[PDB]
Amino acid sequence: DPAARFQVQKHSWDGLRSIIHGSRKAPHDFQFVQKTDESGPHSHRLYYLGMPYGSRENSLLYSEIPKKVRLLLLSWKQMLDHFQATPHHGVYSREEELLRERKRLGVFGITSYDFHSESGLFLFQASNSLFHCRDGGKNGFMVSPMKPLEIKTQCSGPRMDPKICPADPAFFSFINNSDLWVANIETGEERRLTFCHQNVLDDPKSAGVATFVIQEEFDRFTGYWWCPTASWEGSEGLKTLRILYEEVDESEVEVIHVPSPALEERKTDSYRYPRTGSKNPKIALKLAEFQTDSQGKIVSTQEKELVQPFSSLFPKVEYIARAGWTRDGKYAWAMFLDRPQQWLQLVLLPPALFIPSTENEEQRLASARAVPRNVQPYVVYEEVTNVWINVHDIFYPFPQSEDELCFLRANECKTGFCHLYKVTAVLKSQGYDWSEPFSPGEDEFKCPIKEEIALTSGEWEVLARHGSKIWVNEETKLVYFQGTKDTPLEHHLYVVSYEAAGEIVRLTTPGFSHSCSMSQNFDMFVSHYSSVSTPPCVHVYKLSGPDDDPLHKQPRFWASMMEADYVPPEIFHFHTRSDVRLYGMIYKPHALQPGKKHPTVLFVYGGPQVQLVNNSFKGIKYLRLNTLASLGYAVVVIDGRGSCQRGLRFEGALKNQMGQVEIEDQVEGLQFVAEKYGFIDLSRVAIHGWSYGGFLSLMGLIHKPQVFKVAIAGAPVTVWMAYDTGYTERYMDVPENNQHGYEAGSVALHVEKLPNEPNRLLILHGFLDENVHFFHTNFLVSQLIRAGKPYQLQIYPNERHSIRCPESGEHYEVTLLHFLQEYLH
């Protein structure tokens, strides 16, 4: 009991600063391009985004893949010649900074780019502007880097979301001031295609734009999609180009004010923020045509809209999750969702279904009568559930060979795990009088399913979210994908035949988790892979073997791109009293002496769409947990029920009772860790997490005060009523439908249950947080004062939902160390 309890060494504030300062002192976004020159030594050029160790910023790079190897390390050749993509002092525009928050982009420089393979044209944002360069194809392969040519513009403000036109690389598109524009890269000609935008709250219409809740909660960063092929309709031979697009009216969506980064100005910015229960934007898919002559001059432009309203045709639809087109350009498609997020629909939209917009009532019925009777929406798929629809990206339509459609689809709600299915929907025209107005039935456009074959199955998932995707080879009839079949703790690359659902073959080595990228030629892949114990590598594997059995191509290591007082944690697992396997992670105290009992930090997140505990390298993002361990803290992480990678039913334990299930699992994990490992002092446990983790830190202190001595709640969710529609309604329902659950899970309403003793609660929040508004902390403090309750608080004035600036970051870590040092006893 006396000598048994390990006392942490108490440092001064400057001492802790030096400790934090001392502790702190990869290739992605790939494009495989084959070289058509047998006499040269290189088979491919691999293009990618990457940040070298010497460089400040992310940039466009390339490596040369050789034809024969005798351990190769590939050189990182620069593409742009001494180019600063990041603007002066890292100070982005408002639109571009907010895109970086919605995409969680910590890195400076070029973060997306667009590529067109045949022409070899690269298109990207840089310097709060647009830029381009040419390599490969007709332009040829460069040895030395080339300066990227800036694209001139008559538009004022930022040009967001550049995309090259697939049908014609002379053309490209962008968003300027919430409208769709198009332009000619060769001639410099620009043309505006939508006219939704003009002042501020007085200007609620926008076009080609994903709104806040769509970006943040549905992972869609665009609301326009190029048609992939061109028509040649007209009198005298003009070429037509199309863009499907989301139109938005935000009139009835509540406004909130968030402070500007320019603190000296003392202003806010206005923002359409749909809180749970309140109105989301009024939405529509519209179509935009434009014609071109043989000289590349944009002749005419047209605004088209659906022949009947979007709200009449699709009466139950609340959000457009995803959209695009078939590869031949025959149909546009969309992925729709109801407001509960328990009913999804994959809908085809023929171009003939769209007619020109006019304000005149006479003209619209003429164009409506001119639409063929056979033309209509075709609902090819319908996913339904008692839990919720997670949006899965995978939807690969095969080109038709009319009257049916074959496609691959990721589906979780059928069995409870996300799996690939091949589906044939039967397209049969009911015949519709589009001029006379129209009320659809409950299954109005629902295609019959001819067959639905399961390609994958089991107690494991195909990855289809947060950038995971399939690669489909139509020669060999194989679908390449990623998944958890080996284990929840490791991502792995698999291959399976979509023709014949037989043997799934694993192509990545076990004991590591893999983030993979395929050649469109299917001859080689990259895997950026890692483990808990080993830092990440990036290797190039060539798929080799006889062409008579392409399923069993043995992956042979070709070459490498990246290689290589930190002590890794140990994964463990355990069963709850209800027989549910939970995984956990422990960092042991460094230089441990058995028999000692050490104070413990329960690091938590615990919300949906995150798995903390898996077999990949943690020392980059979670260095602070190792730093804690270097001082003699036990650090424990538990993936409780709710967390992702374990299918729908595991996730679904949260449904309408957020806060209620999670802490019990965390307590069980903490008590398991106590019995297994001999070094936890349960008298000195601290709970700590950001966002949902801060919410859970507060729930731990409220419901389990004898378990947790202190709480360091970062950016916490204190009032579920103040969070958005998309996230909150999905897990917790609308507020009027779940009064008991909203109240029970709102930490601000249970402040009487928070401690009478001071030094047991530290709150942290970013002042500029536009995700979880500082209100949450403000309102928690308001209620803490009303109940007569002590608290400590730290603001980060130049910081949103994450602490990006290093000096702020170091200060955060020093404070945490001091709070634990002085008060965790």
The catalytic residue positions are 691, 769, 801
Query: Does 91 engage in binding with its own copies (CB under 8 A)?
Result: no
Query: Does 278 engage in binding with its own copies (CB under 8 A)?
Result: no
Instruction: Centre a 10 Å sphere on the Cβ of residue 561 and count the other Cβ atoms it contains.
Output: 22
Residue partners of 276: CB distance under 8 A and separation at least 6? 720, 721, 723, 724, 725, 728, 729, 732, 734, 735
Q: Which does 757 bind (CB under 5 to 8 A by kind): its own copies, ligand CW8, none?
A: its own copies
Residue 279 Cβ vs its own copies, minimum distance, rounded to whole Å: 16
Question: Using CA atoms, how far apart are residues 496 and 256, in angstroms rounded to an integer?
Answer: 49
Among residues 513 and 697, whose Cβ is nearest to ligand CW8?
A: 697
In the numeric block, the tokens 């190039």 are attached to 540
Query: Does 607 engage in binding with ligand CW8 (CB under 6 A)?
Result: yes
> Site for ligand CW8 (CB under 6 A): how many residues?
11
Query: Does 203 engage in binding with its own copies (CB under 8 A)?
Result: no
DSSP letters spanning 545-578 = S-TT-GGG-EEEEEEEEE-------EEEEEE-TT
Question: Using CA atoms, how far apart are residues 557 and 544, in angstroms rounded to an integer?
Answer: 10
Binder of ligand CW8 out of 184, 341, 771, 777 (CB under 6 A): 771
Residue 686 Cβ vs its own copies, minimum distance, rounded to whole Å: 18
255, 261, 266, 270 alpha-carbon torsion, rounded to 10°: -10
Query: Does 256 engage in binding with its own copies (CB under 8 A)?
Result: yes
Tell whether 691 is in a known binding site. yes
Query: Does 431 engage in binding with its own copies (CB under 8 A)?
Result: no
Query: Does 362 engage in binding with its own copies (CB under 8 A)?
Result: no
Alpha helices in 299-454, H assignment, sequence order: 310-313, 361-370
Of 348-356, 508-516, 543-551, 607-615: span binding ligand CW8 (CB under 6 A):
607-615
Alpha helices in 531-661, H assignment, sequence order: 623-631, 648-651
Question: Using CA atoms, how far apart are residues 329 and 230, in angstroms rounded to an integer?
Answer: 8
Build a one-symbol-per-residue string for 684-723: x at contacts with its own copies by CB under 8 A, - elsewhere: --------------------------------------x-
Query: Does 409 engage in binding with its own copies (CB under 8 A)?
Result: no
Question: Using CA atoms, how far apart are residues 642 and 655, in angstroms rounded to an integer?
Answer: 9
Q: Which does 727 bind (CB under 5 to 8 A by kind): its own copies, ligand CW8, none?
A: ligand CW8
Question: Using CA atoms, how far apart are residues 508 and 431, in angstroms rounded to an integer?
Answer: 51
Q: Are 304 and 357 in contact (CB under 8 A)?
A: yes
Binder of ligand CW8 out of 278, 560, 609, 808 (CB under 6 A): 609
Binder of ligand CW8 out of 396, 494, 727, 774 (CB under 6 A): 727
213-232: which residues touch ligand CW8 (CB under 6 A)? 216-217
Of 30-38, 397-405, 604-612, 664-672: span binding ligand CW8 (CB under 6 A):
604-612
Among residues 127 and 609, whose Cβ is nearest to ligand CW8?
A: 609
Of 330-338, 356-364, 389-397, 773-781: span binding its own copies (CB under 8 A):
773-781
Build a one-symbol-per-residue string for 674-703: x at contacts with ligand CW8 by CB under 6 A, - elsewhere: -----------------xx-----------
Binder of its own copies out of 14, 475, 547, 579 (CB under 8 A): 14
Question: Using CA atoms, how far apart are residues 553 and 573, in angstroms rounded to an integer?
Answer: 35
DSSP letters spanning 47-96 = EEEE--SS-SSBEEEEEEEES-----B---EESBSS---SPGGG---HHH
Residue 606 Cβ vs ligand CW8, minimum distance, rounded to whole Å: 9
Residue 784 Cβ vs ligand CW8, minimum distance, rounded to whole Å: 20
Closest CA to 709 of 780, 633, 781: 633
Q: Are 59 and 110 in contact (CB under 8 A)?
A: yes
311-340: which residues touch its own copies (CB under 8 A)? none
Region of 520 please: left (phi>0), alpha (psi -120 to 50) or beta. Answer: alpha
Question: Using CA atoms, how far apart are residues 712 and 724, in angstroms rounded to an integer?
Answer: 24
Query: Does 198 engage in binding with its own copies (CB under 8 A)?
Result: no
Question: Using CA atoms, how far apart are residues 33 and 372, in angstroms rounded to an integer?
Answer: 43
Query: Does 767 engage in binding with its own copies (CB under 8 A)?
Result: yes
Q: State the DSSP code for 462.
A: B
Binder of ligand CW8 out of 19, 142, 368, 610 (CB under 6 A): 610
Among residues 130 and 604, whose Cβ is nearest to ligand CW8?
A: 604
Question: Using CA atoms, how far apart are residues 410 and 387, in angstroms rounded to an integer?
Answer: 17
Q: Which residues bind ligand CW8 (CB under 6 A)?
A: 216-217, 607, 609-610, 691-692, 717, 727, 771-772
Binding site residue list for Val-boroPro: 691
Q: Which residues bind its own copies (CB under 8 A)?
A: 12-14, 17, 255-257, 263-268, 273, 722, 756-758, 767, 773, 775, 778-779, 781-782, 785-786, 788, 790-798, 807-808, 810-811, 814-815, 818
